[PDB]
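ok posting inputs for the zinc ion job
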Amino acid sequence: AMSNYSMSRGHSDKCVGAEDILSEIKEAEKVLNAASDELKREGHNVKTFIDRTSTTQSANLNKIVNWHNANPADVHISVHLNAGKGTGVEVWYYAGDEKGRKLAVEISAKMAKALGLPNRGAKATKDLRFLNSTKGTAVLLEVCFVDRKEDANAIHKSGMYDKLGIAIAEGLTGKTVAAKNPNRHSGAVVDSVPMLSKMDFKSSPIKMYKAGSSLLVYEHNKYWYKAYINDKLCYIYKSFCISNGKKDAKGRIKVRIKSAKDLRIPVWNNTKLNSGKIKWYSPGTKLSWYDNKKGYLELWYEKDGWYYTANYFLK
Ligand SMILES: [Cl-]
Ligand SMILES: [Zn+2]
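and the output
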Protein backbone atom coordinates (compact mmCIF):
# COMPACT_ATOMS: atom_id res chain seq x y z
CA ALA A 1 0.00 0.00 0.00
CA MET A 2 1.49 3.34 -0.98
CA SER A 3 1.86 3.98 -4.75
CA ASN A 4 -0.47 5.59 -7.25
CA TYR A 5 -1.14 3.85 -10.60
CA SER A 6 -3.04 5.22 -13.63
CA MET A 7 -3.95 2.43 -16.04
CA SER A 8 -5.79 2.52 -19.36
CA ARG A 9 -6.94 0.00 -21.91
CA GLY A 10 -5.78 0.33 -25.48
CA HIS A 11 -8.18 1.43 -28.21
CA SER A 12 -11.88 2.39 -28.14
CA ASP A 13 -15.12 0.42 -28.18
CA LYS A 14 -15.88 2.43 -31.34
CA CYS A 15 -12.35 2.22 -32.84
CA VAL A 16 -11.18 -1.19 -31.83
CA GLY A 17 -7.78 -2.81 -31.84
CA ALA A 18 -6.64 -6.14 -33.20
CA GLU A 19 -9.22 -8.87 -33.76
CA ASP A 20 -8.41 -12.42 -34.76
CA ILE A 21 -8.72 -15.53 -32.57
CA LEU A 22 -8.87 -13.10 -29.64
CA SER A 23 -10.37 -9.62 -29.38
CA GLU A 24 -7.71 -7.25 -28.15
CA ILE A 25 -10.10 -4.92 -26.37
CA LYS A 26 -12.02 -7.75 -24.73
CA GLU A 27 -8.90 -9.42 -23.35
CA ALA A 28 -7.12 -6.17 -22.45
CA GLU A 29 -10.08 -4.98 -20.38
CA LYS A 30 -10.09 -8.29 -18.44
CA VAL A 31 -6.34 -7.97 -17.73
CA LEU A 32 -6.63 -4.30 -16.82
CA ASN A 33 -9.47 -5.08 -14.34
CA ALA A 34 -7.53 -8.02 -12.81
CA ALA A 35 -4.37 -5.92 -12.37
CA SER A 36 -6.32 -2.95 -10.97
CA ASP A 37 -8.23 -5.21 -8.53
CA GLU A 38 -4.97 -6.81 -7.38
CA LEU A 39 -3.10 -3.55 -6.91
CA LYS A 40 -6.00 -2.20 -4.89
CA ARG A 41 -6.09 -5.37 -2.74
CA GLU A 42 -2.36 -4.77 -2.18
CA GLY A 43 -3.18 -1.30 -0.84
CA HIS A 44 -2.26 0.99 -3.72
CA ASN A 45 -4.39 3.74 -5.25
CA VAL A 46 -5.42 2.89 -8.77
CA LYS A 47 -7.27 4.97 -11.36
CA THR A 48 -8.44 3.31 -14.59
CA PHE A 49 -9.70 4.56 -17.97
CA ILE A 50 -11.42 2.86 -20.90
CA ASP A 51 -12.51 4.82 -23.99
CA ARG A 52 -15.96 3.74 -25.10
CA THR A 53 -16.75 6.43 -27.71
CA SER A 54 -13.84 7.69 -29.87
CA THR A 55 -14.35 6.74 -33.51
CA THR A 56 -10.81 7.59 -34.73
CA GLN A 57 -7.28 6.64 -33.66
CA SER A 58 -6.23 10.22 -33.12
CA ALA A 59 -9.27 11.04 -30.96
CA ASN A 60 -8.71 7.85 -28.91
CA LEU A 61 -5.03 8.64 -28.29
CA ASN A 62 -5.73 12.29 -27.52
CA LYS A 63 -8.34 11.20 -24.96
CA ILE A 64 -6.06 8.57 -23.36
CA VAL A 65 -3.06 10.87 -23.09
CA ASN A 66 -5.09 13.79 -21.79
CA TRP A 67 -6.60 11.55 -19.09
CA HIS A 68 -3.19 10.25 -17.99
CA ASN A 69 -1.87 13.80 -17.75
CA ALA A 70 -4.95 14.77 -15.72
CA ASN A 71 -4.30 11.85 -13.33
CA PRO A 72 -0.72 11.86 -12.03
CA ALA A 73 0.78 8.55 -10.99
CA ASP A 74 4.02 6.83 -10.00
CA VAL A 75 3.57 4.64 -13.12
CA HIS A 76 1.20 4.90 -16.07
CA ILE A 77 0.24 1.70 -17.80
CA SER A 78 -1.53 1.01 -21.13
CA VAL A 79 -2.81 -2.48 -21.70
CA HIS A 80 -2.74 -4.00 -25.19
CA LEU A 81 -2.54 -7.34 -27.00
CA ASN A 82 -0.33 -7.83 -30.00
CA ALA A 83 -0.76 -8.91 -33.62
CA GLY A 84 1.64 -10.20 -36.30
CA LYS A 85 1.74 -13.92 -35.35
CA GLY A 86 4.83 -13.81 -33.13
CA THR A 87 4.09 -15.46 -29.79
CA GLY A 88 4.50 -14.30 -26.25
CA VAL A 89 4.81 -11.23 -24.13
CA GLU A 90 6.54 -7.85 -24.47
CA VAL A 91 6.50 -4.49 -22.72
CA TRP A 92 7.33 -1.17 -24.36
CA TYR A 93 8.97 1.75 -22.63
CA TYR A 94 10.38 5.15 -23.65
CA ALA A 95 13.97 4.79 -24.88
CA GLY A 96 16.36 6.05 -22.23
CA ASP A 97 13.90 5.99 -19.37
CA GLU A 98 15.81 3.78 -16.92
CA LYS A 99 12.97 3.57 -14.39
CA GLY A 100 10.60 2.45 -17.16
CA ARG A 101 13.07 -0.07 -18.58
CA LYS A 102 13.45 -1.79 -15.25
CA LEU A 103 9.63 -2.03 -14.82
CA ALA A 104 9.23 -3.29 -18.36
CA VAL A 105 11.84 -6.00 -17.85
CA GLU A 106 10.20 -7.28 -14.65
CA ILE A 107 6.58 -7.05 -15.88
CA SER A 108 7.37 -8.83 -19.15
CA ALA A 109 9.16 -11.66 -17.34
CA LYS A 110 6.39 -12.11 -14.77
CA MET A 111 3.61 -12.13 -17.33
CA ALA A 112 5.42 -14.62 -19.59
CA LYS A 113 5.93 -16.90 -16.61
CA ALA A 114 2.24 -16.69 -15.61
CA LEU A 115 1.03 -17.40 -19.17
CA GLY A 116 3.64 -20.05 -19.90
CA LEU A 117 4.62 -18.24 -23.11
CA PRO A 118 7.91 -16.89 -24.38
CA ASN A 119 9.22 -13.59 -23.15
CA ARG A 120 9.87 -11.34 -26.10
CA GLY A 121 11.16 -8.83 -23.52
CA ALA A 122 11.27 -5.14 -22.75
CA LYS A 123 11.52 -2.97 -25.85
CA ALA A 124 12.59 0.69 -26.07
CA THR A 125 10.98 3.16 -28.43
CA LYS A 126 10.43 6.85 -29.11
CA ASP A 127 7.76 6.14 -31.69
CA LEU A 128 4.65 5.51 -29.55
CA ARG A 129 2.36 8.43 -28.84
CA PHE A 130 1.24 6.97 -25.49
CA LEU A 131 4.84 6.78 -24.19
CA ASN A 132 5.91 10.06 -25.80
CA SER A 133 3.05 12.21 -24.60
CA THR A 134 2.29 10.86 -21.12
CA LYS A 135 4.33 13.06 -18.73
CA GLY A 136 5.04 10.51 -16.04
CA THR A 137 6.77 7.18 -16.16
CA ALA A 138 4.93 4.95 -18.61
CA VAL A 139 4.91 1.39 -19.92
CA LEU A 140 2.78 -0.27 -22.55
CA LEU A 141 1.98 -3.90 -22.12
CA GLU A 142 1.47 -6.25 -25.04
CA VAL A 143 0.13 -9.12 -23.06
CA CYS A 144 0.11 -11.80 -25.80
CA PHE A 145 -0.87 -12.10 -29.47
CA VAL A 146 -4.50 -12.16 -30.68
CA ASP A 147 -3.55 -14.22 -33.76
CA ARG A 148 -1.67 -17.15 -32.31
CA LYS A 149 -3.37 -20.27 -30.95
CA GLU A 150 -0.70 -20.91 -28.29
CA ASP A 151 -1.43 -17.45 -26.86
CA ALA A 152 -5.20 -17.93 -27.04
CA ASN A 153 -5.01 -21.27 -25.20
CA ALA A 154 -2.80 -19.67 -22.58
CA ILE A 155 -4.88 -16.61 -21.76
CA HIS A 156 -8.04 -18.76 -21.59
CA LYS A 157 -6.66 -21.22 -19.04
CA SER A 158 -8.54 -21.34 -15.77
CA GLY A 159 -7.63 -18.44 -13.49
CA MET A 160 -5.18 -16.88 -15.94
CA TYR A 161 -6.57 -13.36 -15.66
CA ASP A 162 -6.03 -13.56 -11.87
CA LYS A 163 -2.51 -14.83 -12.44
CA LEU A 164 -1.81 -11.96 -14.83
CA GLY A 165 -3.17 -9.40 -12.38
CA ILE A 166 -0.68 -10.82 -9.85
CA ALA A 167 2.20 -10.74 -12.35
CA ILE A 168 1.55 -7.10 -13.23
CA ALA A 169 1.16 -6.08 -9.59
CA GLU A 170 4.38 -7.87 -8.55
CA GLY A 171 6.22 -6.48 -11.56
CA LEU A 172 5.14 -2.97 -10.74
CA THR A 173 5.74 -3.09 -7.01
CA GLY A 174 8.57 -5.60 -6.60
CA LYS A 175 6.60 -7.26 -3.78
CA THR A 176 4.98 -10.68 -3.71
CA VAL A 177 1.20 -10.44 -3.40
CA ALA A 178 -0.53 -11.83 -0.35
CA ALA A 179 -3.64 -13.30 -2.01
CA LYS A 180 -1.90 -16.07 -3.91
CA ASN A 181 -3.92 -19.11 -4.70
CA PRO A 182 -1.24 -21.70 -3.82
CA ASN A 183 -1.40 -20.40 -0.22
CA ARG A 184 -5.21 -20.30 0.01
CA HIS A 185 -7.13 -22.58 2.35
CA SER A 186 -10.79 -23.21 3.08
CA GLY A 187 -12.07 -24.49 6.38
CA ALA A 188 -13.96 -23.32 9.42
CA VAL A 189 -13.65 -21.43 12.68
CA VAL A 190 -12.56 -23.79 15.47
CA ASP A 191 -14.49 -24.55 18.71
CA SER A 192 -11.57 -24.21 21.14
CA VAL A 193 -9.73 -21.21 22.64
CA PRO A 194 -6.14 -20.81 23.90
CA MET A 195 -4.55 -20.53 27.26
CA LEU A 196 -1.63 -18.31 26.16
CA SER A 197 1.89 -17.68 27.52
CA LYS A 198 1.39 -13.94 27.16
CA MET A 199 -1.60 -11.62 26.85
CA ASP A 200 -1.09 -11.77 23.11
CA PHE A 201 -2.94 -13.96 20.64
CA LYS A 202 0.21 -14.21 18.54
CA SER A 203 1.93 -16.06 21.39
CA SER A 204 2.01 -19.84 21.82
CA PRO A 205 -1.09 -21.57 23.04
CA ILE A 206 0.08 -23.65 25.96
CA LYS A 207 -3.23 -25.52 25.91
CA MET A 208 -6.52 -25.30 24.00
CA TYR A 209 -9.88 -25.44 25.79
CA LYS A 210 -12.94 -26.80 24.02
CA ALA A 211 -16.29 -25.02 24.09
CA GLY A 212 -18.18 -25.94 27.27
CA SER A 213 -15.10 -27.04 29.21
CA SER A 214 -14.53 -25.97 32.81
CA LEU A 215 -11.31 -24.60 34.31
CA LEU A 216 -10.05 -22.72 37.35
CA VAL A 217 -8.55 -19.24 36.98
CA TYR A 218 -7.71 -16.04 38.84
CA GLU A 219 -8.77 -12.52 38.06
CA HIS A 220 -6.11 -10.44 36.39
CA ASN A 221 -7.47 -7.48 34.48
CA LYS A 222 -10.46 -6.24 32.52
CA TYR A 223 -9.84 -8.55 29.55
CA TRP A 224 -7.82 -11.47 30.88
CA TYR A 225 -7.90 -14.19 33.50
CA LYS A 226 -4.67 -15.85 34.61
CA ALA A 227 -3.77 -19.40 35.60
CA TYR A 228 -0.66 -21.52 36.28
CA ILE A 229 0.28 -24.40 34.02
CA ASN A 230 3.47 -26.13 35.24
CA ASP A 231 4.18 -23.27 37.67
CA LYS A 232 4.21 -20.84 34.73
CA LEU A 233 1.68 -18.02 34.46
CA CYS A 234 -0.57 -18.05 31.42
CA TYR A 235 -3.66 -16.19 30.31
CA ILE A 236 -7.13 -16.69 28.91
CA TYR A 237 -9.35 -14.06 27.37
CA LYS A 238 -12.39 -13.34 29.54
CA SER A 239 -14.91 -12.97 26.76
CA PHE A 240 -14.51 -16.66 25.87
CA CYS A 241 -15.72 -17.54 29.36
CA ILE A 242 -18.72 -17.54 31.69
CA SER A 243 -18.15 -16.98 35.42
CA ASN A 244 -20.28 -16.65 38.59
CA GLY A 245 -18.72 -15.87 41.98
CA LYS A 246 -15.57 -16.40 44.08
CA LYS A 247 -16.17 -18.93 46.80
CA ASP A 248 -12.74 -20.50 46.70
CA ALA A 249 -10.62 -19.67 49.72
CA LYS A 250 -7.70 -18.58 47.48
CA GLY A 251 -9.82 -16.58 45.09
CA ARG A 252 -9.88 -19.14 42.31
CA ILE A 253 -12.86 -18.81 40.01
CA LYS A 254 -14.43 -21.74 38.21
CA VAL A 255 -15.20 -20.62 34.64
CA ARG A 256 -16.59 -22.42 31.58
CA ILE A 257 -15.75 -21.80 27.94
CA LYS A 258 -18.93 -20.64 26.14
CA SER A 259 -20.90 -23.28 24.24
CA ALA A 260 -20.22 -23.77 20.52
CA LYS A 261 -23.38 -21.77 19.81
CA ASP A 262 -22.44 -18.77 21.97
CA LEU A 263 -18.62 -18.69 21.68
CA ARG A 264 -17.23 -16.07 19.31
CA ILE A 265 -13.74 -16.16 17.79
CA PRO A 266 -11.98 -12.92 16.76
CA VAL A 267 -10.76 -11.85 13.35
CA TRP A 268 -8.96 -8.47 13.50
CA ASN A 269 -8.27 -5.68 11.00
CA ASN A 270 -4.61 -5.54 12.04
CA THR A 271 -1.68 -8.01 12.04
CA LYS A 272 -0.97 -7.33 15.73
CA LEU A 273 -4.25 -9.09 16.54
CA ASN A 274 -5.04 -6.37 19.06
CA SER A 275 -7.99 -3.99 19.22
CA GLY A 276 -9.08 -2.15 16.08
CA LYS A 277 -12.10 -3.52 14.22
CA ILE A 278 -12.92 -7.12 15.03
CA LYS A 279 -15.20 -9.63 13.33
CA TRP A 280 -16.59 -12.16 15.78
CA TYR A 281 -17.53 -15.59 14.43
CA SER A 282 -19.25 -18.65 15.80
CA PRO A 283 -17.48 -22.02 15.70
CA GLY A 284 -18.15 -23.85 12.45
CA THR A 285 -18.41 -20.74 10.32
CA LYS A 286 -16.85 -21.48 6.94
CA LEU A 287 -14.07 -19.10 5.82
CA SER A 288 -11.20 -19.11 3.35
CA TRP A 289 -7.83 -17.54 4.15
CA TYR A 290 -4.22 -17.29 3.02
CA ASP A 291 -1.31 -18.72 4.95
CA ASN A 292 1.86 -17.06 3.77
CA LYS A 293 3.69 -18.28 6.88
CA LYS A 294 3.81 -14.81 8.48
CA GLY A 295 2.79 -16.13 11.92
CA TYR A 296 -0.91 -15.35 11.42
CA LEU A 297 -3.62 -15.98 8.81
CA GLU A 298 -4.73 -13.42 6.21
CA LEU A 299 -8.36 -12.99 5.16
CA TRP A 300 -9.51 -10.81 2.30
CA TYR A 301 -12.94 -9.20 2.46
CA GLU A 302 -14.15 -7.42 -0.67
CA LYS A 303 -16.15 -5.02 1.47
CA ASP A 304 -13.81 -4.48 4.40
CA GLY A 305 -10.21 -5.13 3.31
CA TRP A 306 -7.65 -7.36 4.98
CA TYR A 307 -8.34 -9.02 8.31
CA TYR A 308 -6.15 -11.45 10.23
CA THR A 309 -6.35 -14.13 12.88
CA ALA A 310 -4.22 -16.64 14.82
CA ASN A 311 -2.93 -19.74 13.09
CA TYR A 312 -4.84 -21.97 15.56
CA PHE A 313 -8.31 -20.35 15.11
CA LEU A 314 -9.07 -21.65 11.55
CA LYS A 315 -8.68 -25.26 10.33
CL1 LIG B 1 -2.93 -22.74 41.74
ZN1 LIG C 1 -3.27 -2.30 -29.21
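notes: The chain is about 25% helix and 35% strand. The pocket of zinc ion (ligand 2) is lined by residues 10-11, 17, 24, 80 (CB under 6 Å).
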